Design an enzyme around this catalytic site. Structure first.
Site: not given
Length: 470
Positions: A147, A150, A391, A408
């Site tokens: 996903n 956040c 990101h 990441d």
């Protein structure tokens, strides 16, 4: 094939008489077809193409590069440039339109040609790419998260790798429960899979336990709060278990806020616990300058004068002082603020420097030799975009050995130090907002050894049943 970098050549014969664009024969990096491009425009084109022939729209690879034109008279006279770029279909090609003056690449008096042939060289420095099945648990031994809740992922991992907490969490008495309500449980899953999975781990059910649904209850808080929802949550559960008070013993510190009226004799001292430390940056250079300012002394006057009861409004001093610094230090950098002139929730990407070794007992009023207060970098949560969205990543060196990794999402890669550190020092556009430091004397404990034989048993089982049913 999946190499991290390489160099390859492509020579154009019959150059001067060129009219169109020539694609080179593919070289592979990270399991991607990196090609060279040369086309006139008079000037000489030079670009790097990347997996441009694939249809897919869900893939991305970042990379450094050195587009080099070889000099048939001497290598050190060759003319090359540098390029950094994010590649993905919509922009699968980058480079230079005016890479060189055609009138110079054709002057036979300076090398670059022979038989009117020109040789192009491209050294590419590829990162791990998304959308191309990256077996994180292979060239990292670490798995990923999907996903992106956040900043929740970064926080999750950052937490998983806080070993002592991990074991302690495992050992919780999470039986009499409801698999969709129990946070501790909902975390015992993530942690478990986070260890044994080969495929991305699903935040899914954890994201529910807090109620943080629909994802605006993620942008309506920050790491600090989540950390405090999850964490505090897990302890009122460890509240009678052999692993009681584990969290505070790991993250808690005793602070002191005071006041000592200047002209009149009255002081007010208040020790408070603390599970993190919000450091200011705007205007400061490095962490050591943030602490200095944090322990500066604020004077109370004008309207700020102190409310002293039988003394009435008075003139005093007010400041804070540390009494103890946790084993595990969560430092949150304030780069996220509210602009004055706009109505904007702005981010400050100014340059802030944190170090690998932090000296900090010189900020406690009373230090304890034998057990200094020296921490070492353990995690760097990064975030990109001068915007308040974007990101979230997180660098770590899990066993605090100095060996790093980038988490990441579902792409955990091995990376250099200058990539987690000297690379997240602001920029006068992509940077770090939080940090985890562990005290030098408690390292080995905080980062204990993990074994498949620590997880209860009946737990591995419950986690098992639920994973047979439907």
């Amino acid at each position: 094939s999946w190499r991290s970098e390489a160099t390859f050549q492509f020579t154009v014969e019959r150059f001067s008489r060129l009219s169109e664009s020539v694609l080179s024969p593919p070289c592979f990096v990270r399991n991607l077809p990196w090609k060279i491009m040369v086309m006139p425009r008079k000037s000489v084109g030079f670009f790097l193409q990347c997996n441009a022939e694939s249809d897919s729209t869900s893939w991305s690879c970042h990379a450094q590069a050195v587009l080099k034109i070889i000099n048939y008279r001497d290598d050190e006279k060759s003319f090359s440039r540098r390029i950094s770029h994010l590649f993905f279909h919509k922009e699968n090609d980058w480079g230079f339109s005016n890479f060189m003056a055609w009138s110079e690449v054709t002057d036979p008096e300076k090398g670059f040609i022979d038989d009117d042939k020109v040789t192009f060289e491209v050294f590419v420095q590829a990162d791990a790419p998304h959308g191309v099945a990256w077996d994180s648990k292979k060239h990292t031994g670490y798995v990923g998260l999907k996903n992106q809740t956040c900043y929740m992922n970064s926080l999750l991992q950052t937490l998983f790798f806080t070993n002592q907490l991990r074991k302690a969490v495992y050992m919780m008495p999470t039986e009499g429960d409801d698999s969709s309500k129990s946070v501790p449980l909902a975390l015992q899953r993530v942690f478990y899979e986070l260890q044994h999975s080969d495929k991305p781990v699903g935040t899914k059910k954890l994201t529910k336990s807090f109620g943080w649904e629909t994802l605006d209850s993620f942008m309506q808080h920050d790491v600090q709060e989540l950390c405090r929802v999850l964490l505090d949550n897990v302890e009122n559960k460890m509240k009678g278990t052999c692993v009681e008070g584990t969290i505070p013993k790991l993250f808690r510190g005793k602070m002191v806020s005071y006041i000592q009226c200047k002209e009149v004799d009255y002081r007010s001292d208040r020790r408070e616990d603390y599970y993190d430390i919000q450091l200011s940056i705007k205007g400061k250079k490095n962490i050591f300058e943030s602490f200095v300012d944090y322990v500066a002394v604020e004077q109370l006057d004008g309207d700020n004068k102190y409310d002293a009861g039988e003394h009435g409004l008075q003139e005093a001093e007010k400041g804070v002082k540390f009494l103890t610094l946790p084993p595990v230090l969560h430092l949150q950098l304030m780069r996220f603020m509210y602009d004055p002139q706009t109505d904007q929730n702005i981010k400050i990407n100014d340059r802030f420097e944190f170090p690998e070794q932090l000296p900090l007992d010189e900020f406690l009023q009373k230090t304890d030799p034998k057990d200094p207060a020296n921490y070492i970098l353990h995690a760097v949560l990064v975030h990109s975009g001068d915007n308040h969205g974007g990101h979230y990543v997180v660098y770590l060196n899990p066993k605090g050995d100095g060996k790093w990794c980038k988490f990441d999402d579902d792409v955990v890669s091995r990376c250099t130090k200058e990539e987690a550190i000297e690379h997240n020092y602001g920029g006068h556009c992509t940077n770090a907002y939080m940090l985890v430091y562990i005290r030098e004397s408690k390292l080995s404990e905080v980062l204990q050894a993990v074994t498949d034989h620590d997880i209860p048993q009946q737990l591995v089982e419950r986690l098992q049943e639920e994973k047979r049913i439907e």
